[PDB]
Symmetry: C3
Subunit: 180 residues, 3 copies
């Protein structure tokens, strides 16, 4: 019967409708689940990018700081190098020379013993013609048993020479500054 | 004609059911592809989170190290600065003054030439009253053809003056430390 | 009659098919929406990995740089320490000693006052026997009303002693280098 072949067909078609309904429902379920996982992933990505951006900016600053550090090191190393070559050392045994005059406080010492002190004052400067020429300290002066003008005159000359030689020595000390 | 399109609608309904079947399967396929891709994406996020966490911890330690570094830089710069102002320079042409006494080894030199050496020993100290007053080195002494007491006496006075002036010079050297 | 609810079953089945059609269509579109979001998410993950990989390598370089910095800091700190102990200070009040000879420019000074200058030239070296022995500066010389050989001779000896004492002093300055 044509109508009987309609309902048997209807029964088969509803079984198919049931199968489809379940399948569509499952697909919809999965999609909602996938969506949730996706939303969670998107959130973690946002936070990840926030952190990485912070790190990227932070590293940039670190490198800049490292540049300054390298520059400051270069600076202090440069000065130390300069100082090392320019400074007077207390343990070096080879002669050291200054390009300037020198001034110290109480005294100068050689080999632990004092050599030059402060300028000694209270002197009246001698006057005369300084004798820088030949000076014979072993010069002998003859004195006879009777008075001779030339002998005594020779004494006078030697005395005058001696006093002018003293002046020469004194002037030397004064020009150095050892005495006033 | 109840059997009609009861059967032809069944045909139409079956056509639509087959297409529905095809579409559901296609949707299922897509979901499966999405599921695989999402799972891969989620994993990479997990590893990313791990790496970023590591980077964050390493960077924090680095910043702490940089703090110590800046402090050490400040330290050495300060010290170099102190040294720069306090040290005696060998190339400076302007007069330099020490706050201390000074002791050197063999000798002191001026302009490459030795001026003061070690204290010279072996001296016997002269005795007397040093003459620090007026001393005329150009004093002339008259000697006549006949013996005159005042003339020879003046000679004696001049000699005594000279010798006491020598003592004054000698006293200066000993007080400085140039001789023992 | 059987055919009448054959058509009614068709009507009910049509509602279900229309519902299914919309539901499948909704799933399909939703999947396409997910794909777009997922593709965007994947892209950002790729860029994240690029940045993080860069940072990992960047951090490695930095730690290495930091090691060198500490090595350089130790070096300059050591050098400053060495320089600090070995250098001559302008502000130290305690006597400072050199293990070496010293040379300066124009002069040596004590307490702001010049003591030793450049070596004075133009001297002729005195000759004779230097008197380093006993020297009495307070020695008196008798001169009588009449010529006496021993008295005048004593004068001559006193003169010779003085001149030999001058020689001793001059020798001292010359040996030091204060004079040529
Ligand atoms: Ca049907
Ligand atoms: Cl579906």
């Amino acid at each position: 019967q044509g109508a009987y072949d309609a309902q048997v067909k209807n029964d088969e078609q509803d079984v198919e409708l049931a199968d489809h309904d379940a399948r569509i429902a499952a697909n919809t379920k999965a999609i909602n689940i996938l969506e949730v996982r996706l939303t969670t992933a998107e959130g973690k990505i946002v936070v990840l990018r926030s952190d990485v951006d912070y790190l990227l900016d932070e590293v940039i600053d670190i490198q800049a700081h490292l540049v300054t550090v390298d520059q400051r090191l270069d600076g202090v190393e440069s000065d130390v190098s300069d100082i090392k070559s320019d400074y007077v050392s207390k343990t070096v045994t080879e002669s050291q020379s200054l390009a300037s005059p020198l001034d110290v406080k109480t005294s100068y010492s050689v080999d632990g013993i004092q050599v030059v002190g402060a300028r000694q004052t209270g002197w009246t400067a001698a006057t005369g013609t300084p004798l820088l020429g030949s000076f014979n300290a072993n010069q002998s002066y003859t004195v006879g048993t009777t008075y001779t003008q030339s002998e005594v005159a020779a004494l006078a000359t030697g005395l005058e020479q001696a006093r002018q030689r003293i002046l020469a020595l004194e002037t030397a000390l004064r020009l150095h500054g050892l005495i006033d």
